[PDB]
């Protein structure tokens, strides 16, 4: 429980799901909540609203660590990614800075061939 002050809020924002991992400055996790585990299932995981409910259900169950202010990292080009940080302005936090950690390779490995 550790009585931490500030945290780093990683938001993995893929197409089919958003998971929200609130950690500390150090980089080791304090609590996470996903858009799947909030009652939304299948296609309904892939909405911004499930990301908002995920950010709520993380922002409490990190209450016991006592975080006043947090940074926001967002990885992934998904349908959440903005409603989930409106849901961290509204959850009672002070947003220090917001970054983008979406991995852009200087094209390396080959992508899959997926669609027809």
């Amino acid at each position: 429980r550790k009585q931490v002050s500030d945290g780093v809020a990683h938001i993995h924002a893929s197409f089919n799901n958003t998971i929200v991992t609130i950690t500390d400055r150090q980089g080791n996790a304090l609590g996470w909540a996903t858009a799947g585990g909030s009652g939304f299932r299948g296609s309904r995981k892939s909405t911004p609203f499930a990301a908002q409910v995920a950010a709520e259900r993380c922002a409490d169950a990190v209450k016991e660590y006592g975080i006043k202010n947090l940074e926001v990292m967002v990885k992934g080009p998904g349908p959440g990614r903005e409603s989930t940080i409106r849901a961290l302005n509204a959850a009672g936090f002070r947003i220090t800075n917001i970054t983008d950690v979406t991995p852009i390779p200087h094209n390396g490995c080959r992508p899959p061939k997926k669609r027809r």
Binding site: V74, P77, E82, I98, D100, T102, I104, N107, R110, P111
Partner: protein, 65 residues
């Protein structure tokens, strides 16, 4: 991308630069190596560019409105 500033901030600047270069390169690179149709899609894109420029230029005569 990286937004930090004083108390009116945090949304518009970030969704601007984030949304443009992020959604561009990730929505591109997410699948389809293709090896062949960036050539076709750039050729069609730029032929459509010169056809749109000349088409609007000679379409700048009249429209009877």
């Amino acid at each position: 991308i990286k937004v930090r500033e004083n108390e009116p901030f945090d949304v518009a600047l970030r969704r601007f630069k984030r949304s443009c270069e992020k959604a561009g390169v990730l929505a591109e690179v997410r699948r389809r190596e293709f090896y062949e149709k960036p050539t076709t899609e750039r050729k069609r894109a730029k032929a459509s560019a010169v056809k749109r420029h000349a088409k609007k230029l000679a379409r700048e005569n009249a429209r009877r409105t």
